[PDB]
Design a protein around this ligand. Structure first.
Ligand SMILES: O=C(O)[C@H]1NCCC[C@H]1CCC[B-](O)(O)O
Ligand SMILES: O=C(O)[C@H]1NCCC[C@H]1CCC[B-](O)(O)O
Ligand SMILES: O=C(O)[C@H]1NCCC[C@H]1CCC[B-](O)(O)O
Ligand SMILES: [Mn+2]
Ligand SMILES: [Mn+2]
Ligand SMILES: [Mn+2]
Ligand SMILES: [Mn+2]
Ligand SMILES: [Mn+2]
Ligand SMILES: [Mn+2]
Lengths: 318, 317, 319
């Protein structure tokens, strides 16, 4: 099935944020047996390896924005690699790496499927512009570079001349929000972007959140779905090994429910698994809990159902 | 009240599965004050004791299926004891022990009340047949022995010729599923069995799960209910001391909700509290947490309500 | 600042309503955590009214089995006057406890200025034992019985409580979070027909529906002042372990924030009580900080802090 035909891309990149270690995300996700577990559930999996992001040593900040050329070039290469995977009729699976990479992942995916809709699972909106940001970390700005409605508000940052906004504000849905800066809240509300913060998830329940999310993105017409999954969208009791953890998050059950429902549309076309940092647990078990949770979420996007799965054969007459 | 008139049956049996310690389930449940706590809650408790499961020498496997004679005999004895409790007008409360004992518990309950409905709370369907199983552990097969529709698909397994399938596929509702084998999922779907996996619980909420579960089993008219509760249906953060824990389970609150709703029907007729294994708690606190949760679940089955309880007297005069 | 974010802080370091020492350090640890400064960061107009000085009463004989009756009654008497004064200044009273016996004073004082108020009681417990139905004798499990007009006749004359005049009827109080109710309390709750949402109702409906029904019940006819009395033991002990009577199976951190965010949105919050935080009952220092941080998060959510974000009325893209 095309919903189980996958193209794996390793994106060992950390310069979109200050905490070292997130570049090992692809390594620890592979070592948990991701590819093998995907093959076990009938997927046709091709591994495109890890991108060799060459060093960009002269990389002065753009105002307070750190490592602009390195973040820009990593997303530039990733966009080219994602477009290649999409051209091969495979769902792109990007193993991160920090979430600044979503600029490239979504941009490359859009080059092949410009009609795509985005589901962004995260505790954060990642919609600060290079002028509204206070940290200067590019992993908290990817959505700003991608929105067409923000054209005019994104300055000329070195390394990003290749970026052309590819998604309208109406074609993205946030799920999991609980730590939004004032400037980000002003943008979210002014643009009228569809969102389900932890307050909406608490009000409606995840069942209704997904029914509304899929109706919002697929109601006018069926189109490719890009899911950008930041592991910090889940509560730190399931994904502690991440750089910006926030209490009161999505449960392990809610994360599986989101991805099971996205699988069943048959429209998943691109997936990002972002912000796994195996240098940031309090214990080695906290790292293993985080990686196992990310693998579990990944398997659900490609058909693993909690009710069970079976091949089309008579199990009572083998 | 008949909804609080109970017959306790200890079933210290572990040979339906490979991890030692589940035979201590009745001991640690009694040690935690279960019978005394039920009496304090206005229950009429009769203790039928702990079943003596005599060892069977040379219990050779049936193909890959382990301890068939032992499992079959323990369920045979349990069926006879449960039928005895039901004839005395009591709700049978089986303290397990591994889940293979549900063959005996449901069979004995059906000998007295053939029209019963089964609510099966578990991370697992336990519906592998002696032929579809890959572990050979009989605690993962009890539902296959009881189902009328699988008659002709279960081979002649030594120790089980006394079993007469007593439940139709329409008469069972699963709640809690999240770890189902391919063969098991094939059976669940081809039989059309009603189930609320963790996916349905997330989608609907436990309130709707119970409303649909009870409307499905009781729609037509009142009928006895058998609740078979594997403690692994709850998330391992509440019941860690169990052999097959699966994360993303029912919460402690959801477990109390299901049992409080079943109590309110006034139709609870048979109860199994299964898979408590005090040798699998990583700390003595993990053991106590599991035992405390299993006790809380059982008390809710016989009337303990979170909103409060009171006798029909005036507390202000 | 908006009326919804115009606050009067009252510290109530009182512990004689229950037997465990340390709940008197509740107002200190909440302030030490940066509470008042965090409220100012949220556009709040905060005026601190200080910690009430509670005098020692060494000749405080028990009323039958009821412990420290004069000390508890006088503590609540001092608080009713201080709450009524904050209400007269057009501010939302924010009472930092201290044990829940203080709710007699907080609600009594609030009712002196706004007698039409409605109460939302977030707790694992009903706290509706009367001095005759109580088995422990601890007044922190009896405040609601002293406040109800329907119980005028069943409450004996307890020393230190003559000033109390019941101000709320059974129709004016909604409980949320109930999971440990004595038999006498359950009899009172069901005979008075009080609206409640125990953990069973929260599981059945979800916190979304619990709040929609709660607010429709209390506000639906006419808009009125809300008094939120919040016992931290309402939330599960995985979030608020540093408390005297923890009960498992509680409200989550998310449900706590959902209740308070929804109450803020009404724009009618008039009085608030953050009760039973006992920093001496933490098994580890981590459990104490967790309970304090959670109490702080619930408090900020009552005054505008929203999980979806907050922003000033300025253009952030061209300021
Ligand atoms: O701009 C920023 O640095 C901050 N803005 C507010 C939320 C926290 C953070 C960025 C978080 C990035 B993320 O989601 O990819 O982990
Ligand atoms: O057949 C088996 O042994 C297995 N089948 C798939 C689920 C895990 C296990 C059986 C679990 C038994 B139970 O639910 O009683 O704990
Ligand atoms: O009356 C009592 O002392 C008891 N009655 C039963 C519940 C526990 C307790 C009172 C606890 C008071 B509270 O909510 O303020 O912590
Ligand atoms: Mn992110
Ligand atoms: Mn994030
Ligand atoms: Mn099980
Ligand atoms: Mn089982
Ligand atoms: Mn209280
Ligand atoms: Mn309480």
């Amino acid at each position: 099935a095309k919903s189980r035909t996958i193209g794996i891309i390793g994106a060992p990149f950390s310069k979109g944020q200050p905490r070292g270690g997130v570049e090992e995300g692809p390594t620890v996700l592979r070592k948990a047996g991701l590819l093998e577990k995907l093959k076990e559930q009938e997927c046709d999996v091709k591994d495109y390896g890890d991108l060799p992001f060459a060093d960009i040593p002269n990389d002065s900040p753009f105002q307070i924005v750190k490592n602009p050329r390195s973040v820009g070039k990593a997303s530039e290469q990733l966009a080219g690699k994602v477009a290649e995977v999409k051209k091969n009729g495979r769902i792109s699976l990007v193993l991160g790496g920090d979430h600044s990479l979503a600029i490239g992942s979504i941009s490359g995916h859009a080059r092949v499927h410009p009609d795509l809709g985005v589901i962004w699972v995260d505790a954060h909106t990642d919609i600060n512009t290079p002028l509204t940001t206070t940290s200067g970390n590019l992993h908290g700005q990817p959505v700003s570079f991608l929105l067409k409605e923000l054209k005019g508000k994104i300055p000329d940052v070195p390394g990003f001349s290749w970026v052309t906004p590819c998604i309208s504000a109406k074609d993205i849905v946030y799920i999991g929000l609980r730590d939004v800066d004032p400037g980000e809240h002003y943008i979210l509300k002014t643009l009228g972007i569809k969102y389900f913060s932890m307050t909406e998830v608490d009000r409606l329940g995840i069942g209704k959140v997904m029914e509304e999310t899929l109706s919002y993105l697929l109601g006018r017409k069926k189109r490719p779905i890009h899911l950008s999954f930041d592991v910090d969208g889940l509560d730190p009791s399931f994904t502690p090994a991440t750089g910006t953890p926030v209490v009161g998050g999505l449960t392990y059950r809610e994360g599986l429910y989101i991805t099971e429902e996205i699988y069943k549309t048959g429209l998943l076309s691109g997936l990002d698994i972002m912000e796994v940092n195996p240098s940031l647990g309090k214990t080695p078990e906290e790292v293993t809990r985080t990686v196992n949770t990310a693998v579990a979420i990944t398997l659900a996007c490609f058909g693993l159902a909690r009710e069970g799965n079976h091949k089309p054969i008579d199990y009572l007459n083998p």
